[PDB]
Design a protein around this ligand. Structure first.
Ligand SMILES: C[n+]1cnc2[nH]cnc2c1N
Length: 149
């Protein structure tokens, strides 16, 4: 029921991937990369935190109809790394993550949570690197952590 009850200064972003393979690689090696604008957005959030709070990432594969897990950003963005490590060469850079939950949670469990910073659109209709208001993110994080088959 009650996970994440102690996250006073957290910042939470949506990750939308076109590649489940990339997600599987992210889970295996605890690393991720985003778009150029996505990297810079996540980089600013992580570094402006200065270890004072967690940066959580809510992962969902595009078109899957569910979210697939939760990870915490554990590193700043390194923009000069080996290329071609992901599904496409389009992804440049790298940062560490620590996956906390790896589980499929249907969008029905989350669609009624709406983001006041995204024209009050449901959280399940967000784009890649959309930031979630912390009070709405606590709801999503709790539902994911406590969802069971
Ligand atoms: C690796 N990776 C990172 N960010 C994304 N956004 C959409 N697809 C991706 C992907 N495959």
């Amino acid at each position: 029921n009650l996970y994440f009850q102690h996250m006073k200064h957290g910042r939470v972003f949506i990750i939308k991937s076109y590649s489940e393979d990339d997600i599987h690689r992210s889970i295996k090696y605890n690393i991720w990369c985003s778009t150029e604008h996505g990297n810079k957005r996540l980089d600013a959030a992580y570094r402006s935190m200065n270890g004072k709070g967690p940066v959580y990432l809510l992962f969902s594969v595009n078109g899957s109809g569910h979210f697939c897990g939760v990870a915490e950003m554990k590193s700043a963005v390194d923009y000069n790394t080996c290329a071609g490590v992901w599904s496409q060469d389009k992804w440049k850079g790298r940062f560490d993550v620590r996956w906390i939950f790896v589980k499929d949670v249907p969008n029905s469990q989350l669609r009624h949570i709406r983001l006041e910073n995204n024209e009050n659109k449901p959280v399940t209709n967000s784009r890649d690197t959309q930031e979630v208001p912390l009070e709405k993110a606590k709801q999503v994080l709790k539902i994911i952590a406590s969802y069971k088959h």
